[PDB]
Structures are given as structure tokens and as C-alpha cells.
Symmetry: C3
Subunit: 267 residues, 3 copies
């Protein structure tokens, strides 16, 4: 189901989204999940007496960057996580990031687009889904208890472990931990599939939900994005192995308030 | 002509037929020949005073089985015949077959679907057509005159013979016989083509026509189905030779009457 | 953009043009440029008192012939020219050519169709465009000054020269000549692209424009057709190198006048 079409990628499968002074195109879409059912109204935080910095064009655009390389080698449910805000955080994050750390609080929603184009003699299936409270880390900390690098952008892929007991942490054992995940239910999150067969692209938009109408970006990361693979990349001797996966994102109608003087640290 | 579409098989080319508690699907159809122009009304045989066993759900479904293997080897107009009723006849024919031989007479029409899926780097063309009075046999009989096995389902394919003279039968010669066929006109029968190129499927429905409104299934077989090939299967060194041909059929609105006590023989 | 579609070539991309007793078909069109914006009305030359030979069916059809072979070897902007009228001129030009040289003057417009079909594992792009006053020749003349064979149909392809200075002509040098062309602007002419990828065909129709409403076909050729290539033919070891390029043309509503007695010469 969707319009008439293909070897080549056609019509009601060609979509475009313009935002700011950055404009996108895909000639082989299957939708765009507006995850949950509502978007984000630049509804001012009721929390603050701060009549904040609103409707700035300059930050409300599409920042694009590379996540990783997909290749024949990888095993199912191996995964790659992208926390928002903390990856659009500075340098690579335009005027958004700047105004982002000059301010105490933000409240935004994200509109994401992950791209991975192949060829009709390629098999595989990439699962893309946005989940708020989730896990990052990239580590078991040094020498003193608690837990390595959530802000880092998983440089390489992590190993589906024959068992949650969600990478607990201080030399121990017996039993599980509150960072569990059942990568086996990991399709209750607003998601969308990327089937080299069907899909060259996948668009997801998600509203604002933390514990407070606005949160602080120096200790939390309300949503982590996950580009982890559910049916690997077979390739027949001829053919383009190098399956370059790219992601391009857009904060939707952020509302910043609580302004001050350029946050200082990232190792 | 038919909707917009392809390498992949699309839209007004996706059809589904549900019957009983068996439901079909094809994503690369080209039609469905309602052969002759009328179907079969559960019109009760006027022949009998038997207010017969009608509208049974349980038998009015889609029985599926394998006919044969299509392969690079075969020559044009080589053929494979499937007599109805006598193949849905018992065991492999559900509640239809049972109620079929517990009854003296039937009157039905058939809705057939033969399937053979390939790949766009494959050439060939399969001709599928239903003809009532036709020929089966599978033989020149033993030692005494007349003619081997019509009820059998041609286990393997038979050889287009450089000439009808429709396999006459008692050591002879000079001249032809009433079981002729001009496989050269063998496209006057309700038919439909199966072009690996165009077609992955072919659907045919045919009404009731014998000599009597109801016939007896122990000496006649009013219709024989023929899955015989008109442009062979070339394959280029890589590629899936094994071209498995499958057929799935459905009796449409059979009307049985003249009931009694399980018919006895098949060698 | 254009209807839903492909590996195979579909629907609002299937066009047919019937003219006289010659009828065309293409299952992978992208348009038909009616170059300039107006066609040709059998508007009688106002120039002559000759109530000419009009609306003849027999000449107003599609003459088809082969121009050349496209192959992996050729370099960009290499070109092949087809002057009209002088190629439909006789023998190969039906009743048109005959009635053409039995008459002093003609006035017509052309409807052209150049065809070059390939395969989806082929890359390249053929530029097709009609320009009136242009250049032919096929030569630097013999021993006495001025300039080899405009009437000849470039038997083989000519070499894009690192510079117009439009093949001037009597042993010289320093500077350019009035037969310049900037094959670098050679897309201001009514044109149409032929992208093995997109295109298997290209249809162009052009009205009447000379210096006089009717011209004389023994000294001028008001339009030359050019089938010269802008992104060569790569082919991957398997595959049909032999890229046969064919052209089929039709004079639209010619109006002949000024009749006399079969023109005599062509070496």
C-alpha cells in the first residue's frame, strides 16, 4: 500500500519538509510517525516567570550528522543510541546549542530523519525508535562507583546481551537493575522500520514529556534516539558493502528560558 | 495496462478471495477469468426429486496442492492435466471428497488458482486453461484393449506429439482418433497466461456444463485442468532453477444429491 | 514526476502518435517538446501565386532510419547531425522526397522521434536537440576553397573540439568563424534528454522558421537535427554493448509549391 512504483522509489512516496533555512527530500518514504499523537506547542513552561526566548528561526532547522556504519558483521538487536539534547549540544549544534547552554532550561520536541540507502539486491532491516528514559553510558566507571559517559554518542556499536539485568554496575551478579530493557518489546516506543527493501528513509516526530515542564540539560536527557538493527545486511559478491547510516534532526518549537553565562565541561 | 508498479509486483494487481475458512492473496495478478460469462448458481438439478445437501460451508473452500516442477529442460506444448472432480476425490479433498463419495451425484463449478513465482531475470510463459471433455489417461492398456488411468494425476509431464491422432490405442496406425486436440488452438478454452514477466499468478472460474445436470463422479470427469508450458524457462547462471508450480482450487456452490455408502476403489 | 511505475517502463508514460498509415508507440516517454510553442499550420506561402499541392496523406507519415551506434568509447559533446529536408530527400524518403524534388519549394515543420533502449544496469545520457541554422559539412574542401559535404548524413561521429572557432576553413589560424557553437549552451535549442535511466525515447515537434516562407531545398537546410551524447555509456561486464540508436521522423503539414522536372545530383 502506497502509491504505484518501483526498482526506481515513486509519487506519494516522495516527501519534503522545509524548516528554517534547511529543506529536506526523500523519494522512497513510507510515512512519518508523529509519536504519541500530539506534537509540541510552543507552550511556555508555566513553571517559570521567565517570559523566555521563543520562536527563533535560526535554531528551528535540520542539523545532519553521521551516526555509524552498518555492515554484514553485526548481529541482531545490536544497538546505537543518540541522546537528545546533549548531542546537538555545541559546535555541531548551530545557534541552538549556543543559546542552549546560555540558558538553564529548555523544552522542546524532536523531528528526526535517519537515512540509509542501499540497492534491490540487498537484504536487511533497521529498527529506528525514540524512547525517553532509557540508557546510555558507554561504560562501568573508574575506580569509583557510578556509572562512565552519558553525553557521549556511542562511538561504535554495543552488544545485545543475552540478558537484561540492565548493565548493573559495581562487581556483583545475582539478579537484574532499573535500566532494563526488553529489546524484545522495544516496538512499544514510537518507532518505524527501515527495510532496504521498502525503505530508504524513516521520519519520526515526538512531543515534550519529562517529569517537569522544562528540564535542566546539564544533568538529564529526556530522550535517547536508538539506530539498532533487527535483520542483518547480506551481500552478494559484487555489491556496495559499505552501508553508511546517516541521521538528520530538528528541534521542534523549543522554548528556552532561564538565561545565564556559557556552561563549562564535556570529557 | 493495469495500475502503476514494478521490479516490485503493486495496487490494482493485489487481489484477495475469501472462501469458507480459507483466504487467498496475490500481489501480482492480471485478472480472473470467469470462463464463458456465467458462474454457478446453486441451481438444484431439476433431474432429481432429491432435495439435496446444499450450501455447506466446510466444502466450499480452497484446497491447495502441488502439480509439478517446471524446468529449463522442457519443450513447448508439453503438458500436465488435472481432472476435476476425481483429484479433490478423497483425503486430500477435505469434507468435500467425503460427502462427495457418500453421494451418487454432484454438480459444481470450479474456481482455480495456479501459482508460479520466479524473478525478473527469468524468461518463460506458462499457459493455463480449463477444458471440459478432454483427455487424461496416463497410458495404452494391459493386455486388454481399453485405455490405462484417467483419475490419476499425471505424475510427471507428457510429450507433445508431432501430431494428434489423439493417442489412439490398439496397435495400429494409419489415421487419427476422437481424443484429438490441436494444442495449436488450445487458446479457445477459457484460459489465462502466466508470464514470469507479467504474471506470478492466474485465476480462473468456470460454471457447470455436462451432458446431464448432474453427473455421476465415478465414471466421468467433466473438466480437466491443463498446466502445460508455451515458452521455456531460460536461466542464467546464478539463479533459482527450481521453478515450483503450485495449484490451489475451490468447488463453487456444489450441489450434491443422490446419497448412499462410501464408494470403494482407486489403483 | 509522472505516473506510477518501474524496472518495467508504465501508464502516463505510454504514448502513441498515428500519422498517415504509420503508427507509433513508446512505453517509457517523458513528454514531447512542441519547440517554440506553436506548430505548423498548412499556411500557404503568401510568397507564391501557386495554389500548391497540399494535404497529401501519403507524405505526412513517419519515415524511420538508423543514425549510428552509441558505445562506451565516445567522449562528451561528440556529436551526430541530421539535416532536414536533405536526408528524407529521395528513395529513403517515400512520396515526400519524390514530390519534394519535383517541386522548387517546400515549407514544412518536423515531428521527430529518436529511440535508444538499454537496461537498468546501464548509465549514460543522450542529448537530442533541433536547431535551424547550424553546421554540417563533413569536411575542409578539395583543393579549392569552399566548404566538403552538407547533404551527407554524418557517416560516423565528429570530435568535440576544444574550441569553437567553428571549423573555419582555408589554412589559417588566429581567431574564430561564423559557424560557432557553444556546445556549452547547446540547451537553448528545443531539446530533450534521453537518460537510459529515465528515457528510452525522446519526441520533438518544430514549426516553420527560415528567412523566406518557403524556401528552396536544393541550396538550404533550415534545420539540422543533432544526436550527440553528454554522459557516456559505462557497461558492466555481462551486458548488451551495442547501443543501437534509431531515429524516426515526420514532416508535419508540408506545403509544396512551385512545381517542375526531377532535380538531378548527390555525390
Amino acid at each position: 500500500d502506497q502509491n504505484t512504483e518501483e526498482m526506481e522509489n515513486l509519487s506519494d512516496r516522495v516527501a519534503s519538509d522545509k524548516a528554517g533555512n534547511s529543506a529536506t527530500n526523500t523519494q522512497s518514504t513510507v510515512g512519518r510517525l508523529c509519536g504519541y499523537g500530539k506534537s509540541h506547542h510552543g507552550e511556555h513552561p508555566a513553571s517559570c516567570a521567565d517570559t523566555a526566548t521563543d520562536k527563533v528561526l535560526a535554531a528551528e532547522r535540520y542539523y545532519t550528522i553521521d551516526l555509524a556504519s552498518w555492515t554484514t558483521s553485526q548481529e541482531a538487536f545490536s544497538h546505537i543510541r543518540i541522546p537528545l539534547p546533549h548531542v546537538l549540544a555545541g559546535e555541531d549544534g548551530g545557534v541552538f546549542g549556543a543559546t542552549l547552554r546560555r540558558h538553564y532550561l529548555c523544552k522542546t520536541g524532536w523531528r528526526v530523519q535517519v537515512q540509509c540507502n542501499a540497492s534491490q539486491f540487498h537484504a536487511g532491516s533497521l529498527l529506528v525508535f525514540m524512547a525517553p528514559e532509557f540508557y546510555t553510558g558507554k561504560g562501568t566507571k573508574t575506580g569509583t562507583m557510578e556509572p562512565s559517559d552519558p553525553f557521549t554518542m556511542d562511538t561504535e556499536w554495543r552488544s545485545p546481551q543475552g540478558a537484561p539485568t540492565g548493565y548493573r554496575y559495581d562487581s556483583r551478579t545475582g539478579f537484574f537493575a532499573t535500566n532494563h530493557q526488553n529489546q524484545w518489546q522495544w516496538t512499544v516506543y514510537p518507532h518505524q522500520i527501515l527495510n532496504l527493501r521498502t525503505n530508504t528513509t524513516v521520519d519520526l516526530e515526538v512531543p515534550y514529556v519529562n517529569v517537569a515542564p522544562s528540564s535542566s540539560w546539564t544533568q538529564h536527557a529526556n530522550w535517547t534516539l536508538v539506530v539498532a538493527v533487527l535483520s542483518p545486511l547480506q551481500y552478494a559478491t559484487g555489491s556496495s558493502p559499505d552501508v553508511q547510516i546517516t541521521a538528520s534532526l530538528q528541534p521542534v518549537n523549543p522554548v528556552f528560558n532561564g538565561l545565564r553565562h556559557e556552561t563549562v565541561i564535556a570529557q
